[PDB]
Amino acid sequence: ALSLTADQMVSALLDAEPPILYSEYDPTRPFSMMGLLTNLADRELVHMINWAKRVPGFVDLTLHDQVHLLESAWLEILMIGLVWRSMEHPGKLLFAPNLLLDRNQGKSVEGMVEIFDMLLATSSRFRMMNLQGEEFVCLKSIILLNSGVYTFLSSTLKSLEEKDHIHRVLDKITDTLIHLMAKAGLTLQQQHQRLAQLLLILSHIRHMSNKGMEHLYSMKSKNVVPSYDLLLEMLD
Amino acid sequence: LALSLTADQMVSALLDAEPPILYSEYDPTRPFSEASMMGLLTNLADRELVHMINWAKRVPGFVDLTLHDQVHLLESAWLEILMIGLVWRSMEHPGKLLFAPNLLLDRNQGKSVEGMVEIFDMLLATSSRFRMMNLQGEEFVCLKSIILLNSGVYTFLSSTLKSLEEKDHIHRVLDKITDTLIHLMAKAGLTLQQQHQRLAQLLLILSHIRHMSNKGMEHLYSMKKNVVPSYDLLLEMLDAHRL
Ligand SMILES: CCN(CC)CCOc1ccc(/C(=C(/Cl)c2ccccc2)c2ccccc2)cc1
Ligand SMILES: CCN(CC)CCOc1ccc(/C(=C(/Cl)c2ccccc2)c2ccccc2)cc1
């Protein structure tokens, strides 16, 4: 599937997009913050596995490596999705269409408003850059392929082939991002510049995931961080 | 006035601003298993940080920022910058980390402190990736300046007119480093496709470097020691003389 043209790559990613889910609270009852966020994330994760298997090249990998990639990336992917759908809602986070929250509403869990603030800034940055949908799906696929690629625990022949593949798929997505920017009329300089600005935002998204992963682990709750086996059970 | 700088001028500036490679301070005539490995890394890092401040002030456009914003950027970036330095000078030493010329450690030596072999393994993998990519010195200095300028830019948390202007400037300087990276690549004869593919490959490694810094910072905080540089320390070091 690295024979795909740039336009075929975009279409495939656009097709693979997960749906927008709703929060599960009774809207007729008075308005747990973590509870709502957790159920939302749970349900999104199932759809994320579905999406991942539709990212060109992903199912070419071993099941083990697919799990490793998702294990490393799942919160980054949830967060970029959140930031994307929040883009046109300054100062708020659209967790769900029935759950649009501001930073003050985040101040009811310790350490949450700090995370909310980081997400809001990323959304602002997306707005400034006028991030497009076709660019977003590319960046999201890059996260899936990239975040875990430096932490493969082996140098077996197969693992070398797997890493080679991952980097070839990533190069294809780079080629596609550039194409999108060419299609929109950006100059060559502008193209490289925007590529860089987009990819640099991924470091901040990594950062936000790390801070959030710290929170989930501090809870000392058994099922809160997805196990290898859960991911394995879903992917197979 | 560093936005007028050319691509070759930008590289030259950055190469000239490079900090020195420091040596570990242990008595080499003394038994090795005495020394605390966290002790050695901490002292090395302390000394490196001073040189980092002076390097930062020589990154084109960095001293055009407010002192508060300079501090914020370094507060965010300092461990990423130490780590990319480490990974760079380890590039030519497979399976080892060259903390200093007289302190070249493997992953087994990192098993000294619990939780540290995991970080060593990530650093080693980064170094291996640099090796695979045949990372050049001029590309290295560009990436390191990008880390300095980019890592804290999303967390200023001021929307004053001044802060807007500061962020605009940071992104203009970043754009210029991007132009510089591309120029280097075109100079080396890479096709346009190869140029944008390698730019992306290099920038994606920065996310893993962020990751490594976060895991490292988790450790330093876990110690419950003054081991994380305070704002006031960074301010004290940056807010200097000219006497
Ligand atoms: C295995 C079961 N797990 C993961 C699915 C339960 C899910 O735990 C959570 C997963 C994600 C989030 C979350 C955010 Cl922003 C968050 C993370 C950490 C600390 C504070 C906030 C978020 C929720 C929805 C969309 C985007 C982000 C919260 C709990
Ligand atoms: C007192 C304030 N700071 C000074 C920065 C002290 C900060 O202590 C340390 C700073 C850096 C390192 C360090 C590594 Cl790789 C590390 C970090 C966390 C856990 C395990 C290892 C490193 C050292 C030198 C070069 C590259 C990396 C260790 C202690």
Numbering used by the authors:
A (entry chain D): 307 to 337, 341 to 545
B (entry chain B): 306 to 529, 531 to 549
How is this structure described in the published paper?
High-resolution x-ray crystal structures of WT and Y537S ERα ligand binding domain in complex with the methylated Laso derivatives or representative SERMs and SERDs show that molecules that favor a highly buried helix 12 antagonist conformation achieve the greatest transcriptional suppression activities in breast cancer cells harboring WT/Y537S ESR1. Overall, these structures present canonical ERα LBD homodimers with 2–4 monomers in the asymmetric unit. As with other ERα LBD structures, these show significant crystal contact influences at H12 of one monomer but not the other, namely a contact at or near 538 that affects the positioning of 537. For analysis purposes, we have named the monomer free of H12 free of crystal contacts ‘Chain A’.
The pro-oncogenic cellular activities of estrogen receptor alpha (ERα) drive breast cancer pathogenesis. Ligand-dependent transcriptional activities depend on the association of coactivator proteins with ERα to form functional complexes. SERMs and SERDs elicit a structural rearrangement of the ERα LBD to sterically preclude binding of coactivators in the activating function-2 cleft. Activating somatic mutations near ERα helix 12, Y537S and D538G, enable hormone therapy resistance in metastatic ER +breast cancers.
